[PDB]
Amino acid sequence: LQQTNSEKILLSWVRQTTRPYSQVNVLNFTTSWTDGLAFNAVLHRHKPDLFSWDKVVKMSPIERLEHAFSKAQTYLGIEKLLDPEDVAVRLPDKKSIIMYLTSLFEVL
Numbered sequence: 001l002q003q004t005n006s007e008k009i010l011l012s013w014v015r016q017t018t019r020p021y022s023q024v025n026v027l028n029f030t031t032s033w034t035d036g037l038a039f040n041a042v043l044h045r046h047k048p049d050l051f052s053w054d055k056v057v058k059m060s061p062i063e064r065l066e067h068a069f070s071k072a073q074t075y076l077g078i079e080k081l082l083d084p085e086d087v088a089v090r091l092p093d094k095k096s097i098i099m100y101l102t103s104l105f106e107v108l
Contacts, residue, residue, distance in 0.1 A: 001028060010101050014038065017045045021053075029094045029101075034087055036064025042101070043071055046108050050075065061088040076107045 002008035007029065018024045018041040026032040033039065040056045051071065056064050065084035072078040081100045086092065 006098065006102070010098060010105060013105060014042060014101065017042050020045070029097045030092045033092050033097055034061065036061045036068060036084075036088065039068035040064055040071075042104055042108075043068055043075075047075070072104065076104070078103050078107060 002011050011026070011029070014026050018026055018038065021037075021041045021044075024037055024041050026038050036059070037056070040051075040053075044050065044053060044056075051067070056067060059067065062084045065082075065087050069080045069082065069084065073080055081103070082092075082096055086096070
């Protein structure tokens with residue numbers, strides 16, 4: 001949930017942004033990110049003709065993460081701070097998630 005004020009602000013923004021997505025329910029800055037749906041939903045909400053949601057749902061978690069981080073790069077010019085494997089196979093580092101989400105929040 002929300003401990004610091006940066007976490008509270010980012011988590012309500014993510015939750016408002018991802019609100020309309022069925023089967024998405026972001027609860028923290030670690031395990032809610034490992035399957036790759038949340039990052040894709042944050043991006044997609046802002047430009048829903050940018051890619052097909054169905055296509056991302058059919059991808060594996062690693063594919064989804066690589067997709068979201070590449071789409072952010074190519075469309076938003078956001079540097080890839082996270083590696084898909086640091087996210088998909090192990091408990092994500094909270095600091096790192098928040099710092100990447102902060103760069104999304106600023107450019108979106």
